[PDB]
Homo-oligomer: A and B are copies of this chain.
Amino acid sequence: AELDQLLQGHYIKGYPKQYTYFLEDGKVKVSRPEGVKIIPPQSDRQKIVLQAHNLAHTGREATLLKIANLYWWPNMRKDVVKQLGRCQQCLITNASNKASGPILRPDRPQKPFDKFFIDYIGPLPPSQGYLYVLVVVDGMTGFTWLYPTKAPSTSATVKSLNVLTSIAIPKVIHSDQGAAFTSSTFAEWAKERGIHLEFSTPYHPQSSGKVERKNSDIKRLLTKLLVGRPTKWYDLLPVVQLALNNTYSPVLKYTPHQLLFGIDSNTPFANQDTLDLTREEELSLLQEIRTSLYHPSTPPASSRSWSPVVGQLVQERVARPASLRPRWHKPSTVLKVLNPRTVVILDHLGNNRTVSIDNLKPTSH
């Protein structure tokens, strides 16, 4: 219908006059700068697009270029984009081209024992029949306990933490979501002691960074001690623990041990500045050192970042994606924006999931 009057020379919103709209083979044609193109009827158009796109599932420009060979009509890209937004396959397969916003730098825990971060390293080469190391970093001081285990398992973790929590009980233990800690046995152990468990977002180690960064120090120091020799880490663990707790951070200008104790034990090169002050005068200088520690601010956002908006179509990264399968889940919607980097989504389907944005892409179109 809307193509009869055009041949008759009448104006139709969107079709520039000055180009002559003739007829050949019973198809409406137009003579354009780029060439002679067929204008298909409105009803035919969505079909045409889908076909162009389906040749290789190409994005906006690549699809348009195909279509432009044979056809013209007004606002072509509009119909293309519309179609791409509805292609299940591309939505779940294509990568992001938008990076997540700047990371946050959570405030340092205020007092020691406010927060422990924990994690397992390994499997390592069998040393004395032990394969894994439980690592416990105090959040405030960076002080670290090491425990060797036979498996990254709740029972092992409890055994070690029972020893540890003789010195003191923490307010909060932060861990990743590995079977060891997500177990109901662990929750129960913690609830017995009034220790709050808190979990990183799934598949996101940045959140456990205070521990994970310490695993690297451990693994690097052990390695160095083992050059030449057979990998016999078991007997070294204590030495590494002591070594590390007593190492200066060039930025803080203190060792974990210092920040925990306000005075050095009887180790090599023990600092002697406070030797003249009563323990009391020592303990309050320490009180003050701890508050005035360096603290990083968040970096600037990259030119093409994105932030989660409540109610935004969003997709979550597939966990352990099989070979040849899509790298993304179907779309889901943002429910609460907890901070600019953590989000609650209604997923597949429909459970509440607390996820990191690094594991999300904003569904496009």
Contact = CB atoms under 8 A, between A and B. Distances in A.
Copies in the complex: 4
A116 to B, nearest CB: 10
Interface in A268-287: 268-273, 275-279, 282-284, 286-287
Contacts of A162: 238
Interface of A: 35, 51-52, 55-59, 61-62, 65-67, 69-70, 88-90, 92-94, 108-113, 124-125, 140, 145-146, 162-163, 165-171, 193-195, 219-224, 226-227, 231, 233, 237-239, 241-250, 253, 257, 259-273, 275-279, 282-284, 286-287, 323-326
Given A238-B162, A247-B58, A227 B326 contact: yes
Contacts of A261: 112-113, 168, 260-261
Nearest to A244: B56
Given A56-B244, A227-B89, A222 B324 contact: yes
Query: Looking at A165, A195, A224, A277, which has the most chain B CB atoms within 10 Å of its CB?
Result: A224
Contacts of A146: 166
A165 B242 contact: yes
A113 B238 contact: no
B269 A110 contact: no
Nearest to A194: B266
B93 A224 contact: yes
Contact of A55 (B65, B125, B220, B268): B268
